[PDB]
Amino acid sequence: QIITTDNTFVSGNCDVVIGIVNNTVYDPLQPELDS
Amino acid sequence: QKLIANQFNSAIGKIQDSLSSTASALGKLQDVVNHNAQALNTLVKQLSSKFGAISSVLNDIFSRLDPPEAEVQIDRLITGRLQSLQTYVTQQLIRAAEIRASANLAATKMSECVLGQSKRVDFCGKGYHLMSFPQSAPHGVVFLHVTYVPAQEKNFTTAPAICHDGKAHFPREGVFVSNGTHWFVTQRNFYEPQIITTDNTFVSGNCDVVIGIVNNTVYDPLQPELDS
Amino acid sequence: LPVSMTKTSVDCTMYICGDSTECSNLLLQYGSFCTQLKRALTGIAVEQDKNTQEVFAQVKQIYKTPPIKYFGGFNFSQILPDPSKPSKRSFIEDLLFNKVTLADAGFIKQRDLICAQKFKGLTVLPPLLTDEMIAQYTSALLAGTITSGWTFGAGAALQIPFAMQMAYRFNGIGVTQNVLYENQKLIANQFNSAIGKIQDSLSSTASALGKLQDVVNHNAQALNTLVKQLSSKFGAISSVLNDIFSRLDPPEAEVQIDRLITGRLQSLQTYVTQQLIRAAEIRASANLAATKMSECVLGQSKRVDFCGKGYHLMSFPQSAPHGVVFLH
Amino acid sequence: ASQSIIAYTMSLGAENSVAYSNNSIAIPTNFTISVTTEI
Ligand SMILES: *[C@@H]1O[C@H](CO)[C@@H](O[C@@H]2O[C@H](CO)[C@@H](O)[C@H](O)[C@H]2NC(C)=O)[C@H](O)[C@H]1NC(C)=O
Ligand SMILES: *[C@@H]1O[C@H](CO)[C@@H](O[C@@H]2O[C@H](CO)[C@@H](O)[C@H](O)[C@H]2NC(C)=O)[C@H](O)[C@H]1NC(C)=O
Ligand SMILES: *[C@@H]1O[C@H](CO)[C@@H](O[C@@H]2O[C@H](CO)[C@@H](O)[C@H](O)[C@H]2NC(C)=O)[C@H](O)[C@H]1NC(C)=O
Ligand SMILES: *[C@@H]1O[C@H](CO)[C@@H](O[C@@H]2O[C@H](CO)[C@@H](O)[C@H](O)[C@H]2NC(C)=O)[C@H](O)[C@H]1NC(C)=O
Ligand SMILES: *[C@@H]1O[C@H](CO)[C@@H](O)[C@H](O)[C@H]1NC(C)=O
Ligand SMILES: *[C@@H]1O[C@H](CO)[C@@H](O)[C@H](O)[C@H]1NC(C)=O
Ligand SMILES: *[C@@H]1O[C@H](CO)[C@@H](O)[C@H](O)[C@H]1NC(C)=O
Ligand SMILES: *[C@@H]1O[C@H](CO)[C@@H](O)[C@H](O)[C@H]1NC(C)=O
């Protein structure tokens, strides 16, 4: 499944995890953010 | 991760110091040999008993007494040694039942703690069972129970739910605490405070049914991105 | 669940010999029987205290109760110890101690009682842990279970409100926290009405504590069938030791007294074998009781029918004579 | 100095008193990984 902010959670910055990989997280609000 | 690895290595390195000293760590495996050797040394010492006869040796009876009267005293030794062997076999059967009852517990522990994670309290260590590492032992097995022991506690002021707009907000997987001024949401086993939002809590009911409810603002990640 | 047994010590020269004859010199012809019997009996006596140390000595910190007793509407007055009674027991444990009719050695002075089997060489050893120490282990477990939850059995004692502790324990069975906080008074009244019917269910039917009465009945029946074998002659002329010496004469006296000595040694070996079988049964029962204590009192078990009939929430231990009583 | 055999009452453990309250919970900030030997 796509990383869509409902399957993950945010905790701290990305400099303490050993072995992190840069990728994008798809916010499911901004496509539907017409207002 | 590095603190966890350092604590894990320092907890492994103390098992060597605890097993190199104190001289009585592997006592349960020593008693199994020390009971069988004692039961065998009792068996070799009951051959020196006469059991009501004139001699314990079987050779100086038939060359001493005649075929008829020799029998009365040969049977006295035979029924004594057979009773001793019967007592030894009965005690060995009881000890084998004890070793079977211990080996079944060891097999269930090897199944539930080495091959997986057990939720049973104090089954595989004093604490939250993380891992189990078996090691080879003479006439037994030795488990290394990796546990999770909490430390450095801190006491705050708690509440069951939060009143935002006349609605009760109960935590999903956390608990409300307070450092005196603000209120947060925190995991039950580690102090990690977070802002009380709509994703951490759920709405069920109103503000007059919960005994001990408090007042705070429940945040939401939509209305900051909706007003602008 | 039975935990411990009555410890017994057997003397050979008072049971086999009549404690006044010269048959002790004939007892050395058999050899090392009595050393093996005393070693097995002392092993049983050590294991009967090891069972109590494995069941009741779970925690190492004696936890106490607060003086003001409010836990969200719940009434623990039947499981907490009563300070009015000098035994420092609860209102339930007194009913558990007044139902098991064993021979208590609490009498100060010392027409005969059932303890006249000591004169035949059958003594009773007192346990290492007294009842006032089991009642303090039970109080230390209850004051940890009520005030802390499962945290006192897995590390440091972390305090929690009991209304939030039961809301924690409802989440482990699949029920959300909103059911408790809207119906807390009904839950507290149901808990009080269920604890109040425990003493009414124990004061009736006369067989609620039969598993603790059966071990005392077996310990009495073994001693009774051990003192009843002393009147048996095993095929000889009489069961009296000096009557054989007074009736007959040396050559045929020893052919008629070895039949008694071997029979008494066989009866003692039978008693030791049956006590060893009963010790294995009670050791298995004590291991089961310690596992039940660790998995239901010191935590919440998701096992089916292990901590009661239903979805297990909490368990409370009670001190019992030669056993333990759980409130699931 | 003078070693001798002494008799005493068996101690059950330390006397602890958990500070229970209606609005007080305790959450730890650290942890300790311990290895326990079971033979
Ligand atoms: C993940 O992304 C960050 C940010 O884009 C990267 O950090 C940059 O790395 C380059 C190359 O070393 C540097 O020139 C920049 O100065 C860095 N920027 C910052 C803000 O640190 C990082 O290297 C990326 N990691 C991977 C594995 O691709
Ligand atoms: C309770 O926690 C809050 C949040 O961490 C503290 O509020 C912060 O306090 C620091 C220091 O005074 C300020 O720099 C921040 O701007 C504050 N943040 C917010 C959102 O107010 C608060 O001080 C803590 N209270 C106590 C008594 O420790
Ligand atoms: C939480 O907020 C509510 C209001 O939303 C408080 O209820 C008020 O209590 C005062 C004092 O008795 C009354 O005069 C008001 O009429 C109440 N308002 C309503 C709307 O009922 C409540 O007391 C607050 N709780 C705490 C602990 O501060
Ligand atoms: C907890 O339960 C006990 C037992 O029902 C209560 O004790 C009774 O209280 C009533 C009310 O005064 C008396 O009439 C009875 O005589 C008491 N019985 C006994 C055996 O003491 C006790 O009050 C309850 N406590 C709470 C806080 O509800
Ligand atoms: C021991 O003797 C004293 C005085 O003779 C008496 O008061 C006490 O009760 C006796 N104790 C036992 C256990 O017989
Ligand atoms: C809170 O924790 C501190 C430090 O452990 C302790 O001194 C204090 O008594 C505790 N108070 C309560 C109410 O638990
Ligand atoms: C908890 O609330 C009850 C009822 O108001 C009160 O009697 C008790 O003292 C409170 N407990 C504490 C520790 O304040
Ligand atoms: C936790 O304990 C370790 C070792 O005692 C220490 O290095 C670390 O700083 C502690 N962490 C906190 C947050 O106190």
Number of H helices, E strands in chain C: 11, 5
Question: What φ, ψ does residue C91 adopt, rounded to 5°?
Answer: -80, -20
Which residues are within 8 A (CB) of B73 and not within 5 positions of it... i.e. 6 or more apart? B52, B53, B54, B61, B65
Q: At B206, is the secondary structure helix, strand, or coil?
A: strand
Nearest Cβ partner of D14 from C62, C148, C152? Answer: C62
List C-alpha distances in Å: A33 to A4, A26, B117, B222.
15, 13, 44, 10
> Angle, nearest 10°, between helix axes C250-292 and C33-55?
20
What is the radius of gyration, based on Cα positions, of chain A?
A: 12
Q: Is C204 a pocket residue for ligand 5 (Cβ < 6 Å)? A: no
Alpha helices in chain B (DSSP H): 2-20, 27-45, 59-62, 67-109, 224-227
Out of A18, A29, A33, whose CB is closest to B1?
A18
If you ran DSSP here, which 8-state letter would residue A31 be given? T
Q: Which residues of D touch C294 (CB under 8 A)?
A: none
List the one residue out of B53, B71, B54 whose CA is nearest residue B62. Answer: B71
Residue A13 sits at φ, ψ, to 5 deg, of -85, 175
3-class secondary structure per residue, C195-239 = HHHHHHHHCCCCCCCHHHHHHHHHHHHHHHHHHCCCCCCCCCCCC
Q: Which of B181, B186, B216 to mutate to test the pocket of ligand 2 (most atoms within 8 A of CB)?
A: B181
Residue C53 makes CB contacts below 8 A (sequence gap 6+) with C128, C129
C121 token code pair: 């060489």
Burial class (CB in 10 A: 0-12, 13-18, 19+), C278: middle
CA distance C218 to B154: 53
**Which of B119, B145, B141, B123 lies closest to B132, judged by CA?**
B145
Closest CA to D17 of C143, C228, B188: C143
Radius of gyration (C-alpha) of chain C in whole angstroms: 26
- Atom of ligand 2 at shortest distance to CA of B193? 5
Q: Which residues of C touch D24 (CB under 8 A)?
A: 159, 161
D27·B177 Cβ contact <8 A: yes
Amino acid at C301: S
Interacting residues of C134 by C-beta distance below 8 A, sequence separation 6+: C52, C56, C319
Residue of D nearest to C65 (CA): D17
Bridge-based pairing of strands D14-17 and C61-64 is parallel
- Across D1-39, the runs of DSSP E, i.e. the strands, are 14-17, 25-38
Contact C181 B151 (CB under 8 A): no
Q: Which of B157, B158, B162, B163 to mutate to test the pocket of ligand 3 (most atoms within 8 A of CB)?
A: B163
Q: In the complex, which subunits touch A with 3 or more CB pairs below 8 angstroms?
A: B
- Can you tell me the distance from the alpha carbon of B39 to that of B88, in angstroms, rounded to the nearest whole number? 7
Closest CA to C56 of C117, C114, C136: C136
Question: The tokens of C202 are what?
Answer: 């124990």
Beta partners for residue B185, in sequence order: B176, B194
Distance, CA of C59 to CA of C49 (rounded, Å): 17
What span, in angstroms and rounded, lies between the C-alpha atoms of B11 and B147? 10
Q: Which amino acid is at C73?
A: G
- The helix-helix angle for B27-45 and C33-55 (nearest 10°) equals 160
CB atoms within 10 A of CB B89: 10
Protein residue whose Cα sits closest to atom 1 of ligand 3:
B215
**Any idea what DSSP says for residue D38?**
E
C-alpha A22 – ligand 1 centre gap (Å):
9
Strand partners, C182: none
Which residues have a C–N gap over 2.5 Å right after them in chain C?
110
CB-based contact D3:B110 (threshold 8 Å): no
DSSP C85: S
Please give the method by which this entry was determined: cryo-EM
Contact at 8 Å (CB) between C162 and B212? no
Q: Collect all residues of chain D within an 8 Å Cβ-Cβ radius of residue C149.
A: none
Residue partners of C162: CB distance under 8 A and separation at least 6:
C71, C72, C74, C146, C147
Distance CA B196, CA B199 (A): 8
Question: Inter-chain contact B158–D29, Cβ cutoff 8 Å?
Answer: no
Resolution in A: 2.8
The residues with which C185 forms a beta bridge, in sequence order, are none
Best to test chain B binding among A29, A32, A35 (most B CBs inside 10 Å): A29
Nearest to B127 by CA among B113, B110, B140: B113
- For the four alpha carbons of C29, C34, C37 and C39, in that order, the dihedral sign comes to negative
Tell me B133's DSSP state.
Answer: E
> Token match 């027409």: residue?
C111
| Secondary structure (3-state) at B227 | helix
Ordered strands of the B167-171 beta sheet: B201-206, B167-171, B162-163, B214-215
Q: Residue B8: CB partners within 8 Å, gap ≥ 6? A: B146, D33, D35
